[PDB]
């Protein structure tokens, strides 16, 4: 491409996601494909477990499996770190702490390869309970949380974020998952370092009735907010 930063996102952009994971002695891989339309904050993706049965619940991987597709209101476009890092991209790292259970540690590189926005991820699970909500596959196949709270990390020329996800459990209880996130640019060039704000996400998890592989279909709408 000729284009840089926000100019890369003005139409519909193809997305490719590749994840390698290891949790509870089970190595697995996930591939995803779809498209993103940042003008409307809209993402449509289908994910497939390419190694057989996914050893963790699909809802626990949603946040790991491209915040560059967020709709930033015109008055907030100076605060969009994620697009400003493109096409060279950014590293996104998280620790996701499942309350009274284990943790995910994730590292991803998000960048353009030609026309396609690619998210390549490694995930490691730490100290999960075999009888717990995650390894028991006790989570409902839905989603209920929305906000990601962003702050600048100027010393690293990037951002941090923190937010709690609530996963509904089949018995009516909830499993909390506290996300700590850091993003840093891959390249040497400038980025937009934002004032405090948040991303609000609306979602929908579904299934493809013709797909025999373990999979997840995702529709998401994401909008930046919290400044005037």
Author numbering: 0 to 64, 68 to 230
Sentences from the paper on this structure:
The examples shown in the Methods section ascertain that SeU can be successfully and conveniently used as a practical and easily applicable vehicle for phasing novel crystal structures of macromolecules by the SAD (or MAD) approach through the anomalous signal of selenium.
The two amide groups of SeU may serve as donors in hydrogen bonds formed with various acceptors, such as carbonyl or carboxyl functions of various amino acids, hydroxyl groups of Thr and Tyr residues or suitable atoms of nucleic acids. The high concentrations of urea are routinely used for denaturation of proteins, but no adverse effects were observed after relatively short exposure of protein crystals to SeU.
